[model samples]
Target: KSKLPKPVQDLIKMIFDVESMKKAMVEYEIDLQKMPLGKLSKRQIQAAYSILSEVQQAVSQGSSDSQILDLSNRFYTLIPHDFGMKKPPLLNNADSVQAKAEMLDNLLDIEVAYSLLRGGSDDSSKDPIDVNYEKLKTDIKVVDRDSEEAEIIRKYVKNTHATTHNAYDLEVIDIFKIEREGECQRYKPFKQLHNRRLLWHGSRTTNFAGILSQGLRIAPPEAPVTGYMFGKGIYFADMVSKSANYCHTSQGDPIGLILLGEVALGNMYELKHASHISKLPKGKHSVKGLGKTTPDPSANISLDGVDVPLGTGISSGVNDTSLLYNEYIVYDIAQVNLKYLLKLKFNFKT
Candidate 1:
């Protein structure tokens, strides 16, 4: 089972599952007839982002209800959401505009993944695993189960799975070391920053191809600045389950993928409550949303010269905070180095 091809095959099955992509489209109420997977394009998504921005501006200007409804319909027309026999929701406020903008952010990656799957070379003679592997444009090697690296990773998972807040039982099924092409060069500038740590980021399995291909990206320029808790930046979590919750897994499908990245959190700007930050203050490299509890800093460990917060959950002595567990965000994409990819099985209690 440690052989390379089988895991890669399984990874491909999850990442490039066209059926999963279609299911997501239906969940988003996208009109597949008008905007099928093959028809998804960056320009179309960009245009949709623009419409959301306009709606945001219109709402701020206190535009008439008719104007906001018209703008909402324009967005539905471009992206074509399925309403079945119901009336479409109007984008008439900041919250509605922000929500749609976030949806567009997700659609952009879905577009990339769909295109990549379609762009695969057609060759029946070659092994499908090799064919799919080549398209990822990244190198993924399975960690030996008994190796020291795997031991450290499993320890990180075990110790950081919180019981006091949003507790869940997790089984780490597999760990993959990912090296995206050109990522080293991209991350070279921030390699020397102090206080770097391995953190968790979880997303839907269908987004992996795009994530591995494009790297973890910030929201696009056209996206409204309201949805993000700490502005438009890449987010990470210290506790495993905190990030895993973002995977949005369900009882029927309990498997999910999460990323462990080396985040160069050089100087953190810590906050207790939500702050929509568009720019970091001087001398600060990232934002940390402080929670009531955090991994015990005294119990931290170092792996490959990078700090791994594998400590157990402890009271941070910081009360009156909005978050339950710490959240880290980096505005610059280069500050993140994708280190490992973990596939986990969520065991839901009946």
Candidate 2:
């Protein structure tokens, strides 16, 4: 009898499922016996992040083998990565260190969802779906079909839909206006910034709860600088399909969620190739990957003073570029204001 669709309900349940979270830890080779979900303290995760930061610095500085080995051994001892009595993989390179950092990120959110789920254990008979939805601390209202917002959003999805791997179309099943508690207050200071635009960000369904609770974040310092394309920043895309690819969906389960954020992208620092930038140049606020094809600038429209680049794909007339579509990255967490969430059904063609 729930008002939500079956797919959305399944997604919400999956995000809050403590068992699934535990399964993820198992898959990640995390020894739950040593670091159970209940024992996942913020201090522990912080210490892990700090350790990874040292590993990143050591690898980048070309430290001696002994120094790297020492740091790696310390990391394994602190986190206790399970290898079934075998030698754990050394976090000596950037890729291995970054992978562990990403794992910690997911673990932090799993902890958040788990804590919220237990907080309301006083009532046992409540529908788990209802219980899970309530703990989001964010209201998600379904957008009406007849509303202007729906029409505009649908147009954005349909027109921007294209397939690099396979032919298919994205059907927007539901669009929800997500108002996270205290999010507005956090984003109010830079709300008036220039060159504000609405952009797309697609992520795994399991990460939604953490995203809503913590907002989009850059990789921690322990993460490798080479881990990011345009440095450590929140990346967004102008093309829906470009961002949707990051959802990491499969034909088995095609339902995915994408976020529409009002990004305060002021003066952009344009890049042609991978530049592991540590800091933005003076007078620039964000990093943009110039694409070969971009939405027609003439077709641009505005919603509540924020530009929506919904134009059909057109040649950007820029040559020698590594990207096919525009990519935007903001270093400041407060520059992004989460406005809408779309549940799309990615229908694959034969």
The sequence of per-residue lDDT tens digits that candidate 2 reaches over residues 69-181 is 88987877777777767777778888887688767776766777777767765555666786677678777777888999898888788667644634556878888888888
lDDT of 2 at 178: 86
**lDDT of model 1 at position 108:** 83
- Which has the greatest lDDT? 1
1-350: candidate 1 lDDT, tens digit per residue:
22355766788878888888888777777889878889889998888888887887888788999878888899998988887678888778877776676667778888888888778688887766677677788999888889988988898888788775344588988899999999989999999999899999989887888899999999878776766678899999999888888777888789999999999999999998868778999999999999988998998989899999988899988879998899999999999999999999988765
* Candidate 1, poorest ten consecutive residues by summed lDDT: 1-10
Q: How close is candidate 1 to the true structure, as a TM-score?
A: 0.94
User: What are the models' TM-scores?
Assistant: 0.94, 0.85
Checking candidate 2 for backbone clashes, the offending pairs are 53-222
Candidate 1, residue 80: Cα displacement in angstroms equals: 1.0
Work out how many backbone clashes candidate 2 has.
1
- Residue pairs with colliding backbones in model 1 are none
The C-alpha stretches of model 2 lying farther than 4 A from their native spots are 1-11, 26-29, 32-34, 64-67, 125-128, 165-169, 221-224, 276-279, 348-350
